[PDB]
Amino acid sequence: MSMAMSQSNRELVVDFLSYKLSQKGYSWSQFSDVEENRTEAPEGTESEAVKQALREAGDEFELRYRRAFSDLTSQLHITPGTAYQSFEQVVNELFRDGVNWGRIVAFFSFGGALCVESVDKEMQVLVSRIAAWMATYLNDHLEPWIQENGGWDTFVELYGNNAAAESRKGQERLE
């Protein structure tokens, strides 16, 4: 079962999403059912390390240009049933010709800020709906490449703390 891999991405997307609500002080457990830490694991904690991995890199993106991570509902029409139009579009020009772990991490954070934006306008129906879209995107679209690249596990190794670290060390500047 290859599609099963989603099991890790599902919580990935649900976890990351919640991580975003935290910044805005949003009860992520009032939309889906984010019980708590520890979500299945028959080997060790792959998905766990995978989640954090995306969190780190995702921080690098937001820190780079939070501008893009601003009010998105004010620009386009975000409503239950129309949100699909946007996603399909954004996702199109986003992963048109190229994916890589890079676009992946940014993709997770993408829906993150977009979620808090919707819920803020009394529109949570798009929240969960988006979370599933982000995950299924892999099982449906971002799949053959995920494995070919070396499986979600490979991602962890490539963009692991070691990766995001170097970049932050040679980009953040610090001074």
Binding site: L76, S86, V90, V91, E93, W101, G102, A106
Partner: peptide, 25 residues
């Protein structure tokens, strides 16, 4: 009409290209 999504993704794409460079290879 949809100004964001379309452009929204485009802008995000650029940052992506730069987002990665050392990790890969």
């Amino acid at each position: 009409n949809l100004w964001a999504a379309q452009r929204y993704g485009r802008e995000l794409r650029r940052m992506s290209d730069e987002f990665v460079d050392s990790f890969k290879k």
